[PDB]
Design a binder for this molecule. Structure first.
Ligand SMILES: *[C@@H]1O[C@H](CO)[C@@H](O)[C@H](O)[C@H]1NC(C)=O
Ligand SMILES: *[C@@H]1O[C@H](CO)[C@@H](O)[C@H](O)[C@H]1NC(C)=O
Ligand SMILES: N[C@@H](CCC(=O)O)C(=O)O
Lengths: 114, 336, 122, 195, 17
């Protein structure tokens, strides 16, 4: 929440300075409206706030857009020849049915004896 | 490097950044006219020269070939060790079984492999903005233009891009006001979705790619004639069709095989890793794909039973631990 | 000598006297007759070498020192076995070095090595 | 001023209508760029002179190897600092590294590049992804006579010609799994203050 | 992009009815 807090704290400090130089809660009303999707000297100096409001919403959308890009990042098993398969991890268990074709398949190869 | 010498017979003096003076020796080779050579391994020759205090003279290869087995006899650089025209080979020359039965190799300068170099041709603003996508844009504005005094006529155009009441129409406009947002929202992600299509730049991922084992006339593969890569492909029976017909495209030297790639006349080039990677850095428009598959090194060849067998393979082995072979690497290979 | 990825030793499954088939007998020559058998990347090379050129081998583990060192002018470890004619051949994880290669003849290197540094990912 | 601000008698209303169209284009084009967007080695001063730059830096290496000998005879300044943070065994040198005591471990390449590539991975990464210092290799050790030296080398070299050597490390050495915009915000906020 | 025209058609019938 550091990013939100840093952006959240910047609205109070920046808005107050502009109003005092251009001269209460009514001043913050204008800032809140620009912060959502909705005098001349402060107009050009305050117009960049819309850009400042544009970057924050764009960044969150950019951050959110890439959040689903890495969909299902976990890879479980690629099949046979898995390095985990050949080298047991002493925690990820293998099993099968006793006395079947798989027993014969794995009993005729030397390099699978581990 | 090989560059022509000046009129007086001594070639021009260079000073790379601080550098200290560049070390140059006078090569005498092709008739025959003297030249001067800069060198990475020549800067290594001058180091071996002072350690065992033996003087030297350097001449280029007669025919410019590395060396292989002809017909019963050797050619290129190997054809000059055995005959007696040279007592050492200072050049990048890989180590393999066939050569090791006739000469001695010492320990490698640097450890490397070999890869494949191909083109790096990597190039619309709004591709889908046409056909029904553009047609639906005009229909929506025109239909709403006369939906229902002229103040609202321009309203539809302005409300489409941000901004600049009739009771039922006011609610109709209000509900349609959000309708303009959803239709344009897809447009914003439409090009964003269209920005991740990418292209198949993975042209050749090593030898084991199906294109290599089953060569097609569209692809042209080449190497340098009479080299180690030529030998490597004549050891395996399963690759007897690899260069059964792709042998006729083999190039004379790696200096002009790279130029063929940049001319859209060659498609793949197989050569040493330490050379192609350097070229990819300078050119900034080529790329090396695949993975290394025959790892060896460059060693100083020298004729069998030579009395400098132990001296050379110790100074090379010591130079790695001093950092000397790393100071050479930064000044010559990996800079940019 | 035992290096976890290259030379792996095991208690040889003391059922009667034998262990799994993809292993070779070893020893712990010191100067409890336990028998243990070893396997790894290096030993696979040793088996292939003994097949192309005909010879037999008697593996034993070094109980004096480690890979090799020279303290007070005496070599201890794998290099000290070869230097003092106690073994015709040392295999495992030996790095070609300036001081060892002037006393003991090496061969063509298998794989690259050197010095590198690791750090915890953050 | 207002017309230019909005970008960021039925005469000038035409161009402002066109100007509003450009606004959606600039924001939409920004989405394409973002959608596709998603202590070093021994050379630096941190190792040779750690006390002067950053005292919080800990090292170590088992003291009867070749790296210990190479360091001792090449960087005598840093060798006398590693004696206190010395540690035996590589396996015991990873529990302390993960706990938070040590910051870096100096050892071989073929061992470290595999241990970080094993199930011990996901937490350990070598600083040099492909960087190795004082590169050498392995090898067999024989006497000075070494009648078997000649036949062994040719046998080792013909393995490389085939796939035998590089089909062995794929069997034994394989593995798996081998605020922030303050400067931009401060510059942007500072720029508007002057105007 | 057939779905995109469907939303417009539904939108067109929404106000018309
Ligand atoms: C080079 O090797 C020869 C043969 O062992 C020896 O006589 C000579 O002293 C060596 N050179 C140096 C500088 O040690
Ligand atoms: C290193 O060698 C010394 C030699 O005296 C020995 O005391 C010490 O235990 C060794 N350290 C190891 C093997 O980690
Ligand atoms: N591989 C090294 C030992 C490991 C090290 O201490 O660097 C050797 O045999 O000398």
């Amino acid at each position: 929440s550091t990013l939100w807090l840093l952006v959240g704290l910047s609205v109070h400090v920046v808005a107050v300075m502009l109003y005092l130089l251009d001269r209460l809660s009514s001043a913050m009303w204008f800032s809140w409206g620009v912060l959502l999707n909705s005098s001349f000297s402060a107009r050009i100096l305050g117009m960049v706030w819309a850009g400042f409001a544009m970057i924050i919403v764009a960044s969150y959308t950019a951050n959110l857009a890439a959040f689903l890009v890495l969909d299902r990042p976990e890879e479980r098993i690629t099949g046979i020849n898995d390095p985990r398969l050949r080298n047991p991890s002493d925690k990820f268990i293998y099993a099968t049915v006793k006395q079947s074709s798989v027993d014969i398949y794995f009993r005729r190869q030397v390099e699978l004896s581990t | 490097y090989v560059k022509p010498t000046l009129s007086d017979g001594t070639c021009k003096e260079e000073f790379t950044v601080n550098g200290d003076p560049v070390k140059k020796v006078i090569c005498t080779g092709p008739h025959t006219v003297p030249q001067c050579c800069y060198g990475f391994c020549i800067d290594l020759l001058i180091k071996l020269a002072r350690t065992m205090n033996f003087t030297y003279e350097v001449h280029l290869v007669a025919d410019g070939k590395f060396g292989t087995q002809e017909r019963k006899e050797w050619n290129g650089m190997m054809g000059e060790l055995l005959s007696g025209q040279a007592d050492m080979i200072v050049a990048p020359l890989t180590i393999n079984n066939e050569r090791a039965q006739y000469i001695e190799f010492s320990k490698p300068f640097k450890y490397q492999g070999l890869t494949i170099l191909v083109k790096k041709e990597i190039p619309s603003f709004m591709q889908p903005f046409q056909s029904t996508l553009w047609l639906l844009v005009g229909l929506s504005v025109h239909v709403v233009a006369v939906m229902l005094l002229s103040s609202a006529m321009w309203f539809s155009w302005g409300v489409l891009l941000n901004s600049g009441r009739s009771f039922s129409a006011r609610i109709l406009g209000m509900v349609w006001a959000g309708f303009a947002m959803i239709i344009v929202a897809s447009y914003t992600a439409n090009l964003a979705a269209f920005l991740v299509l990418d292209r198949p730049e993975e042209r050749i991922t090593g030898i084991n790619d199906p294109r290599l084992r089953n060569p097609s006339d569209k692809f042209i593969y080449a190497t340098v004639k009479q080299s180690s890569v030529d030998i490597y492909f004549r050891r395996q029976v399963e690759l007897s069709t690899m260069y059964r017909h792709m042998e006729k495209h083999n190039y004379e030297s790696a200096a002009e095989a790279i130029q063929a790639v940049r001319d859209n006349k060659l498609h793949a080039f197989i050569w040493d890793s330490a050379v192609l990677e350097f070229e990819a850095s300078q050119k900034c428009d080529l790329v090396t794909t695949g993975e290394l598959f025959f790892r060896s090194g460059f060693g100083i060849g020298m004729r069998k039973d030579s009395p400098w067998k132990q001296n050379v393979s110790l100074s090379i082995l010591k130079s790695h631990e001093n950092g000397f072979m790393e100071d050479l690497d930064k000044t010559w290979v990996r800079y940019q | 000598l035992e290096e976890r990825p290259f030379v792996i030793v095991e208690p040889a499954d003391p059922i009667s006297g034998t262990c799994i088939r993809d292993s070779v007998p070893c020893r712990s020559q010191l100067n409890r007759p336990e028998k243990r058998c070893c396997k790894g990347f290096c030993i696979d090379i040793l088996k292939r070498l003994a097949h192309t050129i005909g010879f037999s081998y008697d593996l034993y583990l070094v109980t004096n020192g480690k890979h090799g060192k020279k303290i007070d002018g005496v070599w201890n470890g794998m290099i000290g076995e070869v230097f003092y004619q106690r073994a015709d051949m040392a295999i495992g994880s030996l790095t070609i070095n300036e001081e060892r290669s002037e006393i003991v003849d090496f061969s063509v290197p298998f794989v690259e090595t050197g010095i590198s540094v690791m750090v915890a990912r953050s | 001023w207002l017309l230019w601000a909005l970008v960021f008698g039925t005469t000038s209303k035409i161009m402002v209508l066109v100007w509003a169209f450009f606004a959606v284009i600039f924001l939409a084009s920004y989405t394409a760029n973002l959608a596709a967007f998603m202590v070093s080695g021994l050379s630096d001063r941190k190792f040779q002179r750690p006390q002067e730059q950053y005292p919080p830096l800990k090292f170590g290496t088992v003291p009867n190897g070749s790296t210990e000998k190479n360091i001792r005879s090449n960087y005598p300044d840093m060798h006398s600092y590693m004696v206190r943070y010395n540690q035996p065994r590589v396996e015991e040198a990873l529990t302390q590294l993960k706990a938070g005591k040590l910051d870096a471990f100096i050892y071989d390449a073929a061992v470290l590049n595999y241990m970080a590539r094993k199930d011990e991975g996901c937490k350990l990464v070598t600083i040099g992804s492909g960087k190795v210092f004082a590169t050498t290799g392995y090898g067999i050790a024989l006497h000075k006579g070494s009648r078997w030296k000649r036949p062994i080398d040719l046998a080792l070299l013909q393995f490389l010609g085939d796939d035998e050597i590089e089909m062995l490390e794929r069997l034994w050495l394989s593995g798996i799994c081998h605020a922030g915009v303050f400067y931009m915000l401060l510059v942007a906020m500072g720029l508007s203050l002057l105007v």
